[PDB]
Symmetry: none
Subunit: 284 residues, 4 copies
């Protein structure tokens, strides 16, 4: 088996190592040639051109910052794309992923969209998994090589799906990281030591994740009983957080955005409903 | 022992039930007199007035929407407050909690401020804990009755500490819940079942929590090595979430707040730094 | 709108009340005529024959002990089945559900299989939901009446699906109830008071449910890292439970069945793997 | 303070890390000397022998697979055990724990038996609790060091009580995990994604737990009113699960154990009684 990896950021490099360690031949290409030194020392072959990289394998894995980078790198491949399977494991919108499917198809190439759901040090570890979407038959053929990156989670035929699931996951992940900075900033601005919060922040993240099922069922039902918590009570806290952040001279964007959800829910008559009623202002 | 509980939302009623379960004699008062029906049925005594409530015990627990509600309710209490310990377990700003301590002191009452870090159904469960701050010796005299609500975490003499930790905790909690709605809305808008995300969302919450220690070290050091993940790359995803939400007709408020942190960190020169460089734009 | 309910056990009766309360006309039939007294007093009409019951509505809800009961009651309906939608909300196997689909189809009737996921007192409450499977168009038409029973969870076209999900759910529910009896019996046989276990039994059920995601991912991956728990350590406890139950003179069936899973997993070389390796002996 | 921990599976290492984190001087011993690598790296002292371990502290914590392992390890300890407090937090039968107390006493050591009711990652977390039983005054002398592992639940003087509660708890826990595998296997065998069940499984676990109080009252009274749900009807479902599992080629061990309880209760005359009538066949 033979693989090409285009993009040697931390994830591209991690995927090259894991493919090499499992006895796949790896041809790499990278805009910044010098970034390939370590993977070539581990037995990767650096191609001179993306077209060359496309000629050294039927399986082409793209690990780039966005899908626009794919067009920058592959725009000049011409017929070297014909019959290749492009596994794009890059962040972008569902719509640009679908668009890339059509662009690649015009040039005889098959897109399998994917999203890796771990950081680089966990690539190929037990806890690694990857969303995939695009043609089942084409994915199935390459699945035996791809599964070394992580557990494949094939979502279906719509190329946008893997990217949809990636952006949904990253909405949770990135906003959580911004909530941690927000929390530590409030403490640090008030003279308190953010380190003291760590064990409680871990507990309340555990508590938050435990609400996922209630969230699913109430939003799915559009039923929001306020018996244990009201949008008025939780909006009051959203406001206390915003005010406390204003008092402490800390950024206001995140707490303001959360508060706006409760205000617009209450203004819509959901003051007495569960926080899950914010569905009514958030959803399409 | 004797206790008064003022405010009978789900948390007040839960605290009353737990104190009754441990043989505490509990006097209650509520604005909406019907909400007392359940704790009166379990043998709580409904006081006619807040002053009558206060006279019932040395120990007075407030579970109200905010500290304004304290003033609306105990505003005309006067003499009833003298010699009493007011354990205020209501959401508000650290500053308003500190000013409340002053106001209470003038009327010969001590404030212990606190924050309950679990919902009503977990009051008195293994997982329950409560931040407390204020005069150590007063907290300690009442702690054997207070402990029935949850493990007491006494933070110190500053009345605003318990409130500060509670607000920082609810910054994590409320923002996480909103990120869950946001992820579910994106899926639902594109016609996928939000319930499909549930186990992956819980997993990515676990992953997010595992970054807490290195967030503390990097933000305190203002050291942001970008070798595993840059603000540019994660910023790119923050923009992808915003755009995908824009494409699907979902509310952009929360994704826009998170993207504005990356925008600002990058424009402040942290493009090649870790996401922890957002400290530079969040912490002032 | 018009509905027929055949079967006036607690669930049939609960569904009749909820349909009446939402302004649906209800015709009932029951083997035991006298069981209809309360629903007729609430405005249900008792039909003399199942054929009559079939003539008083296009929507026919079956709430019987099994699918064999359906054949007992409807076997003598002849052409009175033609064009009816039979919503069977009865326990049976996926295969007999599919078989009933064909039997009903031969007689011009459409089956929508369902399973109600709450006891009778929660029928029509916020927390009620019902699995449905069978023809989407036919289900969609009746969904506006059926949704009063609980949140419809339409799983797809295969009639067996709702029943599959019901039996899967009930595997969790019934085996949990048998584990509670098993636990209380051990305590009661040893002189201890089962009532003392209740708060800990609630905690450990919460703990158990928290392992659902790990279960999904490891069995899905067929990856069972034993870093936090081995099948040898957990099989040792399964054995201690069986022995303790033998020492106390309490039934052995449940603890023996659990122990057999770990023995067969260890015998297969999974002594050092996670308990999730029992997948390898349990799964098809 | 000083502590010895004998046994370095995940629970032993977790207890060592938590005691070290609180400034306890910890001596360790393990059969597989490599497992000590991690706690030695955090500054635990590796004793050459178990007798050397015991000499290091008045307080000796055992975290072994079973009480046989205690005998294999402390079998030749002899004089080293005199005056020492052995806090044995290992799974075994109440009888073997009681006989262990006798054996230890002869050698001039006190036993405190216990059971940790959370996994290794939650040792020292808010949710952690530990049953203890044995001499009150000895437990109490050591409880300030022991409390760092989790909230101490002292059950009384009988050394077999902590073990009895632990085994009853793990009857609930292990049987629930196996019921989860069983539900997932049924889905997987019929070609449905087990991940689809996850939120409904968690919900039905919640529902099961809500029956705990009425299980206590009905089983103690041997009063089993069948008006909401009969053993015949629930027995029918136990048989449906068994048959559906039989049809799908899934292991029948666990469904057969549960069905045998209904079979036996019905044949003992409880067909029209609540499922709680299974007490009559489980409790002897
Ligand atoms: N890092 C992580 O933890 C994870 C990241 N991801 C996703 O994986 C992808 C890769 O991320 P990561 O490995 O962090 O690396 P980066 O996104 O920081 O960089 C990846 C590669 O993109 C290349 N690149 C970007 N723009 C262009 C362009 N216009 N033309 C040519 N090459 C370009 C870079 O080239 P050069 O080296 O020359 O700069 C580099 O090789 C992203 O889509 C990201 O969202 C997914 C999960 C985990
Ligand atoms: N619910 C939860 O899960 C948790 C809540 N909390 C905090 O606990 C506190 C209580 O919350 P919760 O139990 O949910 O209930 P709510 O905040 O919805 O209501 C609590 C009480 O506040 C009273 N109240 C509000 N405003 C006034 C006012 N101006 N004058 C008089 N009484 C007033 C209500 O009176 P009335 O009955 O007449 O409406 C009610 O008795 C809040 O500060 C909240 O942040 C913290 C942790 C968990
Ligand atoms: N009870 C509950 O909590 C729940 C039950 N279910 C399911 O709903 C269904 C109904 O259960 P439930 O309401 O408890 O009642 P039962 O299963 O105890 O009885 C329901 C009805 O079945 C009838 N019946 C059974 N066998 C025959 C037969 N051969 N011929 C004619 N009628 C027959 C009974 O007739 P008669 O009255 O004359 O005896 C009764 O009307 C079952 O499939 C059950 O698994 C689902 C979720 C919750
Ligand atoms: N893991 C968990 O989540 C929980 C476990 N428990 C209980 O805690 C105890 C420890 O469990 P856990 O940490 O998972 O680890 P294990 O039970 O897998 O192993 C614990 C220790 O037992 C030692 N051991 C086993 N048999 C012998 C023997 N005959 N002679 C000498 N040493 C022996 C092992 O030595 P070696 O290292 O050489 O193999 C190891 O150090 C068990 O009783 C378990 O039921 C309770 C709650 C939670
Ligand atoms: Ca606790
Ligand atoms: Cl506690
Ligand atoms: Cl504690």
């Amino acid at each position: 088996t033979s693989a090409t990896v285009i993009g040697l950021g931390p994830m591209g490099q991690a995927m090259v190592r894991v493919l090499l360690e499992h006895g796949t031949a790896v041809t790499v290409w990278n805009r910044t040639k010098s970034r390939a030194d370590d993977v070539v020392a581990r037995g990767a072959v650096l191609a001179g051109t993306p077209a060359e990289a496309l000629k050294a394998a039927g399986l082409v894995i793209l690990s780039l910052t966005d899908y626009q980078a794919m067009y920058d790198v592959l725009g000049d491949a011409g017929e070297a794309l014909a019959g290749r399977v492009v596994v794009n494991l890059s962040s972008d919108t569902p719509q640009r992923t679908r668009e890339a499917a059509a662009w690649l198809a015009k040039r005889g190439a098959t897109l399998v969209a994917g999203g890796i759901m771990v950081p680089a040090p966990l690539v190929g570890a037990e806890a690694s998994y990857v969303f995939y979407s695009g043609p089942r038959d084409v994915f199935a053929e390459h699945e035996p090589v791809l599964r070394h990156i992580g557990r494949p989670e094939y979502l279906g035929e719509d190329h946008g799906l893997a990217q949809l699931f990636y952006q949904a996951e990253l909405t949770v992940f990135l906003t959580s990281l911004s909530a941690y900075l927000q929390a530590f900033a409030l403490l640090a601005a008030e003279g308190a030591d953010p380190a003291r919060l760590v064990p409680f922040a871990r507990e309340v993240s555990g508590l938050a994740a435990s609400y996922l099922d209630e969230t699913v069922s109430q939003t799915r039902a559009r039923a929001y009983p306020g018996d244990l918590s009201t949008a008025t009570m939780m909006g009051a806290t959203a406001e206390h957080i915003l005010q406390a952040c204003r008092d402490a001279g800390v950024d206001l964007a995140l707490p303001e955005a959360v508060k706006s959800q409760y205000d617009r829910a209450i203004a819509a008559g959901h003051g007495g409903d569960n926080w899950t009623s914010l569905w009514e202002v958030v959803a399409k």
